[PDB]
Write an enzyme that holds these catalytic residues in place. Structure first.
Site, PDB file in Angstrom:
ATOM      1  N   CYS A  33      13.992 -18.165 -11.650  1.00 27.18           N
ATOM      2  CA  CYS A  33      12.833 -18.162 -12.131  1.00 27.18           C
ATOM      3  C   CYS A  33      12.738 -19.670 -12.992  1.00 27.18           C
ATOM      4  CB  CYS A  33      12.369 -17.160 -12.840  1.00 27.18           C
ATOM      5  SG  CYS A  33      13.027 -15.365 -12.080  1.00 27.18           S
ATOM      6  N   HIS A  66       7.427 -16.045 -20.904  1.00 27.72           N
ATOM      7  CA  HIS A  66       7.902 -15.643 -19.390  1.00 27.72           C
ATOM      8  C   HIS A  66       6.765 -14.581 -19.065  1.00 27.72           C
ATOM      9  CE1 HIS A  66      10.095 -16.273 -16.047  1.00 27.72           C
ATOM     10  NE2 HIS A  66      10.834 -14.821 -16.054  1.00 27.72           N
ATOM     11  N   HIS A 115       3.910 -14.457 -10.212  1.00 19.90           N
ATOM     12  CA  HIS A 115       5.164 -15.316 -10.831  1.00 19.90           C
ATOM     13  C   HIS A 115       5.588 -16.008  -9.520  1.00 19.90           C
ATOM     14  CE1 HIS A 115       9.433 -14.616 -11.779  1.00 19.90           C
ATOM     15  NE2 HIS A 115       9.040 -15.698 -12.193  1.00 19.90           N
TER      16      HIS A 115
END
Ligand SMILES: CC(C)(COP(=O)(O)OP(=O)(O)OC[C@H]1O[C@@H](n2cnc3c(N)ncnc32)[C@H](O)[C@@H]1OP(=O)(O)O)[C@@H](O)C(=O)NCCC(=O)NCCS
Lengths: 848, 852
Positions: B161, B293, B331
């Site tokens: 990520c 995040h 995401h």
């Protein structure tokens, strides 16, 4: 600000289970490219039959890496292998991995293929989530960072063929800049999936002959190959081993080229090279050898070598030596750079450039091969000296070059005391693991650096490396034990023994050892104003030296202090301490109550005060009777003096009564000094004269600690004013009072390690009987042993065998690092528990 | 120690074809997560129905990127999209990509998936070699480096990520250090292969609701999403637009953790943050907002936010605003960081924080949400001012944090500068591409920086952007053309015209333009000691000013010099030069033979020497006869003087003979009209009277004769004798010769190549008519001034526009005072107005291309 070195390396290459097998194949001119069916049926889809392949993908010491078996079976074999190779590479450099845990050490892994991930995610019905954690490209770096606790960057990067050398280059800048103290750099490639070789074939990149004919006219493409390689970089200050220093390194990219994205731009390669030499103060004249990319392609070989000609040859009087490890083992794509790096470093270390294969006829488009400005290394040439260049250029245009300065430090000359024996420890996963490291020690018993490094890496948690061993180097045979350990934290007990342990020329042997001799020379300063030197006494040849009761008391206790000093220097601090007689003085030193000076004078005056009162003849004898049963049967004048065990008791009294009561006791079959009677009434005569002399030496009584168990004062009065401190009062009391030894031996816990600190290990017998079955009892010196240094070392070895960590390096003068060039490799002797074996994807797991 | 800025950005996000559509969805509270069957049947293998998906993967302007169709069809759509987005991002920053070609500009692309490569390599029998070059992970970076000619690093990196923000961070250090002047940073993720979502599902990472409920108690996993984002970083000195300055950035890694490799270590995240603030002189007090995040996971949300609480909140009086772009669009795994970056930068640029979705009930394990030290942005709040933090933490433990300083420069006041018209150029792939950029200019015609940037990016090779256009801003109506170009490099010709082109108060209009006014004021210094100032003459109200033949000669040639100076300042250097009459003086300036002083005096003395000789009344007339046919029919004393074209010839002689030979010529139906000449007969025997007196005066002005170049074609000397001693240099001798000899104009106009662009450099474009007839059909002929036009500045600008229309590059920005960069905050986005040729549609892998 800041120098970066290559500290350690390991790898698996084609037909090469480790870097030693790799070197053997290189210098021996073996071709590691093979044509068997290991990965897929050779010929499949018209592919070349030849490729560079690893011997095995199925092995992995899962429990060492905390991997349960269900996950091990679903890890990319790239990663399983990289975990082992990464560990191998760190310890190769003489570095205990624990020293880097928690640090901002970085990890960079060059990797281009995740063929196992593809395989293990093909069936939605049956696939496992954990396959991602063992196969996804990021994990090739991230799992390393997780296992080794390396908290700096953790990056998996792909620039195709240049990936692993780019990883070297990125790590290099991170260390130079200060970001990172060190870095683990990996390169990995496997040939699991045939379709990939087909794509390459269809691009025209693979030679049908399956051969990188680096620099040859005949060259017509590359050979695909496998490799798992890792390298540890550190800043100079952390290094032990140093293969080379990285002088410079950079990357650029071909950019835009009319001929297409996969046409190598020799001009831009040249540009990269030019930017790294003259502008940084590094002259092309300084190079001895350049490891070329050298994939052996019609187009790329001339581009590259002509680029070398223009960037480097043009500024040189002498021919430049050139080679390519790809001729030997093929091209392992992103791992190419580190694979080549290991060739260069092995070559440097052995003093000989490993030659290329397949070089018969220079490519005629490369002027410098025909006019001798470039000289292909086609037979083994000796290493003449100089910097080294490495090229790694990826097929998308990402170019990397690194400039190395080889390490050339030589071994020190042997001195007076390299003649001595040394001690070598080892830890390992299996019996063979330990056996091999010890054998290597034996075979290089003179390489002080090699041994120093092996010792640093031996101190490990016992949970992780459950086998230990030691050997004594520099002595007659194979002196060696090896055994399995159980993870009990085994507590360490010191026993300082009394009189009776003196002998003729004791410590003549240990005076050779600089560390011991210094603790004697410090005991000399305590007794120089009183006209005595212990160093003279120990080194004396005179038969009668230790008959004199002051020579004996001072030498006995000065040796106990030296033994404590050594034991301390190798990292042993005692959990409990126990004396016997004069030993309670040495216990005081071990406990931090008496200084060295205080304890040596408390022996001198204890001995001087008894010598000066020219007392009547007395005697002692150990007898086979219990404590209460000695008071019963003892003739008047004789008293039970030392309670050694439930069976042994030493009696004390006048010569008359004791010699008679012993001959009458043997005539009923019962078990049966300086002419003195210790721990009797006889010494109440000395009590006042001593107390006065030792009040002048022990000015400031320091507290005894919980760890020291007294034998001069029963348990009952442990709390008393006398027992608080190691006072002059405590010492006098010891002399007159009985020695309550078996009393303390009850207190020794289960599985303890008991060290008899005495110039001869008299109480061995007694301690076995007195202490629990589990406990191991270890002597340190033995009387009239051919060599007590050997003995001492061998018994420290036995301590290491228990699971307590011991570092012998402090016994001898410290080795000056960096280690000299040629220090033997460590990586190939790190052996694993491969009882194992694990799943590996196969060709049928992919599409067709 | 070099300042690094975020210069430009673009992207494709869920339901968002560009960053404008993305901003609309953000500030509007639209949820970009959808549940349609685009990638695979929703529900398949028990997967969440919801995911963030791009509207289209099938488009790509292949020929612009040099990709032939067989390869386009076998490229990862990630890459096809990234190529466009990367171009979009560079020009978004006001930067012409050509300015970075050949440089050590780097490329770093965060990317975790090569699902198209898998698909396109499934059948050995039929697969293509080219598929590797379009699909292998290294190529996601390497093809960018190839197209843009960026010779710095070219790296594809994967830290899951955190990959795209790590790429930002790596690029940041390369620029700060000096390695690179600039860097292209990409992040990409596509959801092509369902098996991948199954792996994530089985790891427990995906919420069934398919929603990142950032910071909510309800949060139970993440939503997978797609994204293609790119950003241009430069060192401050190269920037035009500046979204923000990167104050600091780093990465660390969680390392060893008892709980497992995918458990986020809030303590180590905290450590990273701590290392970047107080130790670098940056105070946590200075932050306004932190983009977390915020994947919305049971475990990770508290770890993260509590880490923020300890690293930053603990050193702050005021609440810290917090958000996560993942609530809005899900995401997109490695592209998460740059996706979130665009949220922050769009928010900053519009002055308003785009709010999170799905925040109903604070996670009770996070004290700072309950006590107000962290304040979730759950409705739109205005941007009050301050630094900005961004977190991006990958599931394998690789953490990144970057600290931004938003740009807050404001537009200058319009002030004491009263608003001139400006010229705006555009290039594009299609008609719409050009129309849109021009429309944007018109709608923001007062944003000087925005216009200055649009002009910089309009200069492109004509092969690549075959449509051009211009408009003139700041004037009555819509002055605009747009047209297709052909890829002939069209050569540029200057024509300096003669007499007849004077008029009452010419150049009053262009004196507004600082650059022109200065070339007049320099011509003033050449003729101040001779008691004349050209600036006064042009500004004079006196009807008769230019009747005087010295007032006319000097003013005409001083204006020609100023026009040459302007044309030069905007980057036009001529491929050929041609004079007529007095124009050969100006040609000398354009060729580098005469200095400005030399050429203005060669006009003064040429005029003063004729005024002094008060010769006989003479006349000239253009007549409808060819060159050889004038020598035939001309009465003695009249000579053919100027060869204008095959049809027009100007005759010269005594008033008597010429006025009669014109009335006799109309009585044979032939074209014949007098030319106003001041009653003078140029290019006849009459001027051999002037020859000696001039030669002497001009020997004092042209001291060191400099060579004429191949470019300048003479009209005073026939082709045959171009090699001669006279023709070598622009001497006093060359000039006198021009006066007496005929003007051989149509002679030179034959030489002008095919498809050339011809500029009539004169205060009125008299020879337009003649040049059309004299020069090849293809060639386009462009005036620069017109007599009694309401506004000649508008006219001049409009005609520079027409030059740009041809394919020759022109940069108007030099005509006006330079704009001070960085551009002010709020300068309109450029990326969303870059339009492509999406006529072709391309292959996209589908679910059935993977195993099941
Ligand atoms: C090509 C050419 C025939 C075209 O002439 P044109 O189109 O009539 O151009 P003009 O400049 O005369 O202007 C057009 C009109 O404005 C008028 N005009 C306005 N201001 C004027 C001025 N300052 N001077 C002259 N005429 C002017 C003209 O009389 C004419 O009137 P009309 O429309 O009633 O006929 C002619 O300009 C030509 O051949 N010129 C070159 C002359 C030459 O070679 N040398 C001259 C000195 S060396």
């Amino acid at each position: 600000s800041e120098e970066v070195v290559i500290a350690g390396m390991s790898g698996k290459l084609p037909e090469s289970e480790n870097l030693q097998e790799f070197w053997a194949n290189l210098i021996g001119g073996v071709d590691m490219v093979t044509d068997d069916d290991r990965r897929w049926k050779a010929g499949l889809y018209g592919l070349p039959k030849r490729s560079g392949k690893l011997k095995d993908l199925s092995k992995f010491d899962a429990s060492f890496f905390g991997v349960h078996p269900k996950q091990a079976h679903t890890m990319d074999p790239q990663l399983r292998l990289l975990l082992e190779v990464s560990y191998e590479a760190i310890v190769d450099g003489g570095i205990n991995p624990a020293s880097l845990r928690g640090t901002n050490t970085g990890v960079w892994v060059g990797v281009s293929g995740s063929e196992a991930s593809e395989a293990l995610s093909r069936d939605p019905e049956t696939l496992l989530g954990y396959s991602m954690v063992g196969c996804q490209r990021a994990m090739m770096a991230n799992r390393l960072s997780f296992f080794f606790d390396f908290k700096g960057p953790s990056i998996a990067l792909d620039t195709a063929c240049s990936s692993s050398l780019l990883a070297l280059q990125n790590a290099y800048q991170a260390i130079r800049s200060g970001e990172c103290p060190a870095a683990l750099v990996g390169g990995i490639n496997l040939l699991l999936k045939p379709n990939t070789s087909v794509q390459f074939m269809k691009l025209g990149m693979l030679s049908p002959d399956g051969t990188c004919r680096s620099f040859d006219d005949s060259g017509s493409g590359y050979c695909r190959s496998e490799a798992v390689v890792a390298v540890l970089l550190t800043k100079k200050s952390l290094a032990r081993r140093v293969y080379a220093t990285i002088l410079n390194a950079g990357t650029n990219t071909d950019g835009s080229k009319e001929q297409g994205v996969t046409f190598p731009s020799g001009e831009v390669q040249e540009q990269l090279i030019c930017s790294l030499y003259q502008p940084a103060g590094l002259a092309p004249e300084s190079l001895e050898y350049i490891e070329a990319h050298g994939t052996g392609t019609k187009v790329g070989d001339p581009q590259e070598l002509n680029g070398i000609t223009r960037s480097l040859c043009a500024f040189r009087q002498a021919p430049l030596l050139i080679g390519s490890t790809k001729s030997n083992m093929g091209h392992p794509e992103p791992a190419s750079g580190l694979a080549a790096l290991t060739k260069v470093l092995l070559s440097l270390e052995h003093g000989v450039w490993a030659p290329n294969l397949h070089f018969h006829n220079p490519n005629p488009e490369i002027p410098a091969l025909l006019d001798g400005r470039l000289q292909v290394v086609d037979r083994p040439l000796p290493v003449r000296g100089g910097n080294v260049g490495i090229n790694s250029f990826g097929f998308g245009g990402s170019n990397v070059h690194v400039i190395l300065q080889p390490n050339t430090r030589q071994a020190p000359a042997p001195t007076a005391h390299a003649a001595l024996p040394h001690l070598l420890h080892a830890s390992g996963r299996t019996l063979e693991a330990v056996q091999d490291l010890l054998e290597q020690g034996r075979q290089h018993s003179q390489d002080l650096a090699f041994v120093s490094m092996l010792n640093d890496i031996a101190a490990t948690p016992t949970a992780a490396m459950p086998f230990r061993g030691y050997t004594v180097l520099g002595v007659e045979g194979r002196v060696q034990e090896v055994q399995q350990v159980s993870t009990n934290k085994r507590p360490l007990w010191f026993i300082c023994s009394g009189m009776g342990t003196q002998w003729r020329g004791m410590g003549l042997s240990l005076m050779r050892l600089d560390s011991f001799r210094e603790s004697i020379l410090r005991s000399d300063e305590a007794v120089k104003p009183l006209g005595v030197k212990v160093s003279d006494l120990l080194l004396s040849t005179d038969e009668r030296t230790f008959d004199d009761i002051v020579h004996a008391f001072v030498s006995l206790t000065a040796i106990q202090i030296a033994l404590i000093d050594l034991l301390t220097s190798v990292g042993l601090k005692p959990d409990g301490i126990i004396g016997h007689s004069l030993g309670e003085v040495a216990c005081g030193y071990a406990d931090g109550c008496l200084s060295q000076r205080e304890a040596v004078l408390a022996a001198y005056w204890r001995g001087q005060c008894i010598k000066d009162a020219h007392l009547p003849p007395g005697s002692m004898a150990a007898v086979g009777l219990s404590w209460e049963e000695c008071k019963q049967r003892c003739p008047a004048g004789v008293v039970p003096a030392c309670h050694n065990s439930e069976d042994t008791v030493t009696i004390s009294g006048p010569q008359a009564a004791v010699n008679e009561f012993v001959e009458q006791l043997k005539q009923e079959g019962v078990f049966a000094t300086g002419g003195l009677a210790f721990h009797s009434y006889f010494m109440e005569g000395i009590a006042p004269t001593l107390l006065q002399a030792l009040k002048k030496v022990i000015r400031e009584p320091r507290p005894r600690s919980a760890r020291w168990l007294s034998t001069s004062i029963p348990e009952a009065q442990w709390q008393s004013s006398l027992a608080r401190t190691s006072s002059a009062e405590y010492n006098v009391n010891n002399l007159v009072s009985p020695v309550l030894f078996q009393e303390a031996l009850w207190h020794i816990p289960e599985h303890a390690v008991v060290l008899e600190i005495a110039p001869h290990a008299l109480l061995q017998a007694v301690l076995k009987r007195g202490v629990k079955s589990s406990c191991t009892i270890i002597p340190l010196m033995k009387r009239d042993h051919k060599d007590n240094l050997e003995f001492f070392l061998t018994n420290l070895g036995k301590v290491h065998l228990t699971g307590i960590n011991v570092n012998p390096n402090a016994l001898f003068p410290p080795v000056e690092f960096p280690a000299p060039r040629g220090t033997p490799l460590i990586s190939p002797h790190i052996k694993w528990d491969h009882s194992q074996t694990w799943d590996v994807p196969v060709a049928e797991d992919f599409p067709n």
